[PDB]
Design a protein around this ligand. Sequence first.
Ligand SMILES: CCCCCCCC/C=C\CCCCCCCC(=O)O[C@H](COC(=O)CCCCCCCCCCCCCCC)COP(=O)(O)OC[C@@H](O)CO
Ligand SMILES: COc1ccc(S(=O)(=O)N2CCC[C@H]2C(=O)Nc2cc(C)cc(C)c2)cc1
Ligand SMILES: CCCCCCCCS[C@@H]1O[C@H](CO)[C@@H](O)[C@H](O)[C@H]1O
Ligand SMILES: CCCCCCCCS[C@@H]1O[C@H](CO)[C@@H](O)[C@H](O)[C@H]1O
Ligand SMILES: CCCCCCCCS[C@@H]1O[C@H](CO)[C@@H](O)[C@H](O)[C@H]1O
Length: 298
Amino acid sequence: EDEFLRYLWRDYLYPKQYAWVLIAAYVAVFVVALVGNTLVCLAVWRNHHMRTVTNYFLVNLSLADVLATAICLPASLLVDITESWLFGHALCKVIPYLQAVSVSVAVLTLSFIALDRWYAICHPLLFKSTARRALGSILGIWAVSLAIMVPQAAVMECSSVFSVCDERWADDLAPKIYHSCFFIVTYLAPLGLMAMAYFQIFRKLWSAEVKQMRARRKTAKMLMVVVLVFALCYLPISVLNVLKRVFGMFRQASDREAVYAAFTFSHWLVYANSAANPIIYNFLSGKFREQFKAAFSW
Ligand SMILES: CCCCCCCC/C=C\CCCCCCCC(=O)O[C@H](COC(=O)CCCCCCCCCCCCCCC)COP(=O)(O)OC[C@@H](O)CO
Ligand SMILES: COc1ccc(S(=O)(=O)N2CCC[C@H]2C(=O)Nc2cc(C)cc(C)c2)cc1
Ligand SMILES: CCCCCCCCS[C@@H]1O[C@H](CO)[C@@H](O)[C@H](O)[C@H]1O
Ligand SMILES: CCCCCCCCS[C@@H]1O[C@H](CO)[C@@H](O)[C@H](O)[C@H]1O
Ligand SMILES: CCCCCCCCS[C@@H]1O[C@H](CO)[C@@H](O)[C@H](O)[C@H]1O
């Protein structure tokens, strides 16, 4: 008698509740990431004491996050709902390209933040870190990120079956080599180097010198948290694409709905990172929190 009651859940209640959780998480992250990263930029613009090398890199990180949130997030939500591509051939190349560029700008900015902190803290006076040179490095980050993701744009193809956007690979081996390289370069190597750098920064940082020590320890604490949430937020999708592209996993159709759910949550986590960073600055930086509240109360 309760077969009908269970089927109503299986066929209507659950599907509606799951589409609802999906759209609500994607929308909340959209709003929070857009507003918070814009506030990061406006805060750095308003408070001159915040115009440090690190904060310039953090505004660039917020700029990359705003790019991915404004353009890629709505499209990623539509793909995760319908498992189909509704934006045409050109956008099938452009949107994935901007997603890869956003990831590359983000990880290089964190790398250069860790490099600046490592030279400033661990081997001092060797290299000068000025805001104009930091701005030069920022332009170089965009130049590299835009150049090295061109192959990513090149492999995208939009083909019908109701269109579907996916990578078109000429050989069995090329996707494995490319995604091995992509994983090692945009995730594992920069984050491992940053972890050893921040480990050394932590060991070296832990009487008038103490005033400097009080400010630098707080920012370093904040920066390590930024790196950690990044490594955590990007870990699942990065691992999943490797298992899919290098190891050939997730091709059985008996569990197609479970794989869609896992990839959808991992996509959502990438965007959740853009929402998460401004909250991190608000709770680990007193200057940022004050500027956000000066903006917040208006
Ligand atoms: C795509 C490229 C983009 C690059 C973008 C640039 C990003 C750059 C960011 C920061 C650079 C900072 C580098 C800091 C490196 C610090 C490395 C280091 O010393 O760490 C050790 C711990 O691990 C060790 O033993 C050595 C651990 C070895 C095992 C590592 C496994 C690989 C994981 C990771 C793979 C990365 C490899 C990249 C190679 C090019 C020891 O600590 P400790 O205080 O005792 O030292 C005292 C000692 O220096 C006395 O001689
Ligand atoms: C290491 O961390 C990562 C993080 C993300 C990826 S990715 O899978 O997102 N990516 C690979 C090809 C390029 C990019 C991709 O397909 N974008 C994308 C695809 C669709 C259909 C829709 C949207 C909005 C973006 C890979 C590694
Ligand atoms: C954690 C797992 C997440 C899976 C998400 C699946 C969302 C849609 S449920 C779907 O509803 C249909 C209604 O017609 C039924 O016919 C199917 O049997 C059932 O699968
Ligand atoms: C393509 C132009 C991009 C503009 C970004 C500027 C990058 C730094 S220029 C550099 O600034 C240093 C500041 O300390 C001076 O010491 C040097 O003499 C001068 O060469
Ligand atoms: C011994 C092996 C020799 C292989 C020679 C052919 C190499 C083809 S690369 C090919 O270029 C395309 C350009 O569009 C991409 O779309 C594909 O994904 C990619 O695979």
